[PDB]
C-alpha cells in the first residue's frame, strides 16, 4: 500500500457459514506477522438468497497510515461436512 497508504481497512468479505462453522476475519498490517482480528465489527448483512456479507470498516493504523498489510479469513469448523464457504472478498484499504 506504498501506492496508497491506508489508516483504515474495510474488510468486506462474503461467506456462507453452515451451522457453527466460522471465518475469523483478520489483518496483520505488519504483513502477516501478528494476525490481529478486525477490532471494528463486520456489518453481517445477508448478501443474497444464501451468503452473509461481512463489511468490516476499521482504522487499522490508528495514527497516520500503514504503507503495507496482510488480510485473512480463518476458515474453521466442528466437523468436515459443516464446511464454511467463501467468495467475493472486497477489502478497500482506506484512509479515513
Amino acid at each position: 500500500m506504498t501506492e496508497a497508504p491506508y489508516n483504515t481497512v474495510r474488510f468486506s468479505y462474503e461467506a456462507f457459514l453452515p451451522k457453527g462453522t466460522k471465518v475469523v476475519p483478520k489483518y496483520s498490517a505488519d504483513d502477516g506477522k501478528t494476525w490481529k482480528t478486525f477490532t471494528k465489527s463486520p456489518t453481517t448483512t445477508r448478501a443474497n438468497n444464501e451468503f452473509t456479507r461481512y463489511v468490516i470498516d476499521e482504522k487499522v493504523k490508528s495514527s497516520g497510515t500503514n504503507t503495507k498489510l496482510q488480510v485473512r479469513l480463518d476458515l474453521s469448523t466442528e466437523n468436515s461436512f459443516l464446511r464454511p464457504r467463501v467468495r467475493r472478498l472486497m477489502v478497500t484499504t482506506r484512509d479515513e
Binding site: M1, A4, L75, R83, V86, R87, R88, L89, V91, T93
Partner: protein, 96 residues
C-alpha cells in the same frame, strides 16, 4: 464496451475525485486463482473452484478403485474390462 471501459481508465487518471477522492486500493478474491492466495502461509487451507468462483476448507482426496466379488458378480470380467454374463456362439464359419 471494453474500449469505452479503457476510455474510463483514460478518464480515471484525471476523472475529478471519482470518489470524493477517498479510495486507497482494494485487495479482492473470487476463488478461481492462486495469486491473491497466501498458500505460502502454511496454515492456509482452502479449495477454490476454478470457474465456480467459491471455496471451502481443503480436502483429503481419498481415491479408490473398487474390487470385485467374482461369483456374485454375474458379469464376465473381460480381461481388464467387465462385461455381462455370456456364453459364446460361432457367429461365422467357412468350412472349405
Amino acid at each position: 464496451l471494453e474500449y469505452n471501459q479503457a476510455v474510463n481508465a483514460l478518464d480515471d487518471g484525471a476523472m475529478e475525485g471519482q470518489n470524493p477522492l477517498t479510495l486507497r486500493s482494494v485487495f479482492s478474491e473470487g476463488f478461481i486463482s492462486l495469486d491473491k492466495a497466501d498458500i505460502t502461509h502454511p496454515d492456509f487451507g482452502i479449495v477454490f473452484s476454478f470457474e465456480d468462483a467459491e471455496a471451502t476448507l481443503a480436502y483429503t482426496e481419498a481415491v479408490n478403485q473398487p474390487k470385485i466379488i467374482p461369483g456374485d458378480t454375474t458379469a464376465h470380467i473381460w480381461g481388464r474390462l467387465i462385461s455381462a454374463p455370456f456364453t459364446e456362439e460361432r457367429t461365422i464359419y467357412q468350412g472349405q
